[PDB]
Structure formats: C-alpha cells, structure tokens
Subunit: 135 residues, 6 copies
C-alpha cells in the first residue's frame, strides 16, 4: 500500500534557522494502522524538490526522516560551493529510508536543520511517501 503527505506552502513559506533538527510541518505519515506488525516494512521517500538556504558562510540545509520516538532513519543535505552565493539557488533534494513496522511507531516524519547559521526555506511543493509491503 501507499501512504503519502504533501505540502505546497507558496502563500505561507516555511523556514528554519535551527541548528538542531526540527519537524517540517505537514510532512508526516500516520502509520498507526500498520504498527506492531513485524512482517511489514516501509520504504520511505522524502522529496523536497525546490529548497534553498540563505546566508553568508557556505549556506545549506539538512534533512532527516525520523520516527515519533525520535529515531533517525536517514539524513542528508545540500550546500552551496561559494561562501556568499549571489542568489541562493534551488537545490533539489530526495532522501530514502527503510523502516520495519514491528514497533509501536505511530508516525514517520520529516525534519530539517540549518548549516553554518543559514536559514533554510521551502515555498513550494514537497512530499513524504512510503510503500508498505510484507517481508
């Protein structure tokens, strides 16, 4: 089966300047109905196709897929090559994780953080999804 959530914050853009991972609002999958099932596995894809980061010390952004119990299943990020980009461009990002559904996990969700004091921004479509299958 497929589980899916998307956001499109074009009229209310999101941002963070957090050095620690924090939730991206709306990018959460409710997997409660599949919880406590050792024979099920989720393949999760976080797709943030048009992010950017502003700043003056090689700005960038990090992203993670995490459970409601705070377990980090995957992480990665983008950065610019110049210390002070002329105009911080859009740097597509995708991340793929796997999770067994044996535990009482309720939610699988996206998080983000900054780098070198940047501000990360999302102002357009992004999604989190999973394919759930038997082992």
């Amino acid at each position: 089966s497929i589980v899916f959530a998307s956001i499109d914050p074009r009229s209310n853009p999101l941002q963070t300047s957090s050095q620690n991972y924090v939730d991206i609002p709306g990018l959460k999958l409710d997997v409660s109905k599949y919880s406590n099932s050792p024979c099920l596995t989720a393949l999760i894809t976080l797709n943030i196709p048009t992010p950017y980061a502003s700043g003056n010390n090689f700005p960038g952004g990090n992203f993670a897929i995490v459970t409601d119990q705070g377990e980090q299943l995957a992480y990665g990020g983008f950065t610019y090559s110049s210390k002070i980009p002329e105009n911080s461009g859009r740097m597509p990002f995708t991340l793929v994780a796997r999770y067994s559904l044996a535990s009482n996990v309720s939610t699988i969700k996206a998080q983000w953080s900054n780098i070198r004091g940047s501000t990360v921004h999302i102002d357009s479509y992004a999604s989190i999804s999973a394919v759930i299958q038997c082992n």
Copy 2:
C-alpha cells in the same frame, strides 16, 4: 505493479526555452489499463538525474508531473546561484507525486519549462515511473 518509461537522448538531445509547461518527449506513462480503479493509487517518480540550464539571468529549469487532462500533480525546479554561471553544471532533480486511479485519465506525463529566459537541457538518461498499489 510497476509502470516505467525512460529516455536516453544522447545522440539527439532535448531542450526547451518554453515559458509554459510542455511535455518532455518520451517521458509518459500509459495507465489506461488501470483507469477508473477506485481502490488503487500510483506513486509517481520523475527522475532527471543530469539536467542543466543555459542562460544569463540566474538560469534554471522547472518540472512537473501532469495528467492528460492537464492536472498538475507536482512541480519543482533547480536554479544556479550565479547570474551567469561559468559552465552550467549538472543539477540532479527528482520529483514525487501521488495519483488516485479513480479517474478516467489514460496518461501521466512529465512536463518542463524555463525560467528567466533560460534553456533547459536533457542529453542523457531520465525516467518516469509509478508503483501502483491497492489502498489496502
């Protein structure tokens, strides 16, 4: 099930300077066998791993996943951080969409458009794909 289409236009590269979204040639999925299936969902992934854009005003490219009825299911894009890039680099791009097959749609396809007068280029492998699963 899996539906898949790829291109590899190395000998006859593709480009667009269209301001409006137009089809990327060859990146279409035929889902007609699954049309009006109320219990099925498609997770669609557009993978353009090696595009670039030429131009002189912070060039880039936009991409979308669209039905044959013109419904835009997802969109996004890349841009460079310099006004006039020294040598427009390859900027990998992936886009993921969801589509309920409770519809009379026959085709899902990839679209692209330019930004600030750029030209977008594909000269190598790219794909569009879907995983089609029962909701239960």
Copy 3:
C-alpha cells in the same frame, strides 16, 4: 517486496578518482530469490556527495547488474571551474529491471569526471520495489 541496503561512512569516508565505473562498497541488493521470473524498480539515493578538483569537478553514478548491464546513469557537476568549497549536491537515480534473466545482484557504481575525486561521507542507500507485472 522491498530490498534495501544503506551505508553511513562517517568514520571511514569513501572516495574514488576512477575514470571507469567501480562499485560503491555496501550499495548492493541481493535479488537472487527473484531471478528467472517480476520487475524491480531500483532507486539509488546519494543525498550528500561532493567532488573535489579544479576543472569543473563532479561525479557520475550508475545502477548495474552483475551481468554488467548498465540500467541507468547520471551525475552532478559544479558551475564554477574551481569551486571555493565543493558543495553537497543531492543525487537520486531510478532504474527498472525485468527479473526474467539470471541476475543475482543489482548494485551502485561511481566514477569521476575531469580528474575529480568523488566523496561519500554520510548516509546513502539503494533500494528496490519488486512487483508482479
């Protein structure tokens, strides 16, 4: 079904200056059980690579079978000749493979460009969804 492999080479980063495609260690899927049948949709996710060099550096990646069949390839490059500090350029590649053949392994490979060195020092994955046609 789902097949999956990941790496996270923080304490011993991976690098290549190979002009020809070479395996990325740890990013291999065993599809043994499904050979001679089914289609696999394969996603290579390298979310945080970079490449060092002084001539428009970048990195190429491929998904290959043990039969030597290149199913997909692509790469990233920088827009400057000599990047100030080669940035992280997220990369994802998606391939398909019919499991009608005698394939056992589907794996990731990488290569350099213009004499670069490609680097992975954090999480990356390869995965497949295997389904009936």
Copy 4:
C-alpha cells in the same frame, strides 16, 4: 489474506434436528478488521467432509453460509437415495460463497438444518475459510 476456523468434535459430536437453520458452533470467521471496506471481497469455503444424517424418511442435511446480520450467501445439502438407509454413510460436502466487505458485517458463519425430520451429525474435522482480496 486468509481467514480460517476449524472444528474437530471427535470427543463431543455435534448434532441438530432443527428444521430451521441454526449455527454450527465454532465454524465462524471474524472479518471485523476488513469490515466497512468496499474495495475488498471474500471468497468463502465451508468444508464438512464427513457428515451423516440419521432418520427414516430419506434423511439428509442442509448447510448455509450466512452473515451476522442473517443474510444467506449460499446453501446446499446432501440426501440419501433410500427411505431408510441401512447405515447412514458419510456424504462429503463443500459450499462456496462470495461476499463484498462494504457493509459493517462482523462475522461470516456456517449454519445447518435437517430434512424430513432427520438428525444431522458432525463428529470429525470440518472447516470454514476465506480468501480476502482487493477488487
């Protein structure tokens, strides 16, 4: 998925002389977790491989598959050819039904009744099962 129940009343045989359909104890499938699902269908098989009926007026037995709301999805039965069988033999019986799981149905179960005043008997293995699939 498969749902399954069996009985083996070798040490506590079951019988009925009811002219109206009544439940066969233990031959019930709980389909609660699949209820209220218009996209799911059950294919149900009732297998009573070794029944017999006693009596003196062409004895036999009837069986049905029914929902907890009393909807009869299938029926059939066996009978002997002689008015007074010398020793009522075992007459294997199987019945197959289909049910959409759109409704709030909880249970799918077996029932039995007599014919011409017989007594129907089960004293060995019998089962009810279903294959549940998406439409």
Copy 5:
C-alpha cells in the same frame, strides 16, 4: 483477485440428458482482462445435484476454457441400479489454468451417464483466485 459467478435456479430448474458435455448456463467466468499474462485456481461448486434414471444414474461435470480445453472433470453416481429417490450428492471440482494464452472465458459443463437426466435446482457457483506466480 477473485472472479465469481453463481446461479440459483429454483423457479426454473436446469437439466441435461446430453451425453456430450454442454455448458451449464450462468456458470461462466470472464478472465478477459488477465489473458496474455498469472495463474487461475478455479473451483466449481455444485452442492446439491441429483440424477434420475434406471441404470446406475449419475452426472459428470467439467471445467473448460473457450479454447475447448478440458482442465478438469469428475462426477457422481449412485450405488443402486434404480435409486428409490435419487439423492443429493454434493460435488466440487478444482482446476488450474495458466493465463499465458488468449483465453477469455472459463466455464462449467455437464453431461449425463447411462442415459440419466442430471438436475440442478438450487445454488451453485464457479469461482477463481487469480494470482501472480
């Protein structure tokens, strides 16, 4: 997936005295959508038939494709030459079919034995479970 058909011919019972297999009306499965692919496991359920006659009567049943392929057959007969009142003899038959071919329909057929007349006057079904190998 499940394909299913049933009949319940109480107000207009069905009968045959045909020595050759003939279709039982209403007991046909449309497998159109699955041709040229998958296996079907097909169950014919005739829970309450009987046969009239005076020379060890009985009835035969088969599962057949529209290509004329007999996938399974079997039948019931009585142990007495002239049954006092031909009793109900439950019948089930199970077949398999690979859907690699161009088949559209899988259906039930029946025939008599030793000049009997076979009868169905109550519920009966044909069904299939269609699955990937």
Copy 6:
C-alpha cells in the same frame, strides 16, 4: 501465489487397501521455496471428485492432508449406506486445510486409507492445491 498438482491415472488407476494412511501417488505440493516464511499461510484443498470404494462391510475411503514431518492437517472420508453396495458409486470428496509456512516443511501431500477392509480407487482426475497469501 498458487501451487498445484494433479493426476489423471486413467490408464494406470490407483488403489489402496492400506489400513494406515499412505501417500496418494502424485498428489504432493512442493512448498520448499516458501519454507520458514513467518508471514505466510497456505490454504490447501484436496479435490478427489470421482473416487469409489469396493468391499462388503459398508465400504468407504479416508483422506488426509499431511506434511513431510507426518503432521496431519485435516482428514475426512466417504462411506456408503449399504453393507454391500450393488455397484460402488462415485462419491465426490473435497478437504480443506490451513498451514502456516512458519516451518521447515518442504512438502504437503495427500494421503488415503481404507475402512472395514475396503479398497479405495482413483481412476480419473484429482488435484491438490494451495493459495499462499501474506497474513496481512
């Protein structure tokens, strides 16, 4: 998935007068590819549509579905209602069992045995089959 085996021994009919259960030749399912699969269940159907039994003391036949480790998953049988049937009629028989594949078993097979000194006969099509499904 489906696993299936059939026989049709018209030219070389099968019989048993064994008091103890023995294998019905040819009616075996190989489930070795599915062994030790904790999340899978098999629904097994033994279909013997046209057996008969000869004998002179209320003859009949017994049938079972058994694993290769000797575990009897289901059983049942037919018998005639007369001591000495005039002409032992064909008595259709079907048996359904469940088997969890959380086991190292490799084969599921059909078995038969006699009753009251009968001989059981199969001279025509018969099958054993399983539908194998994930529990979820």
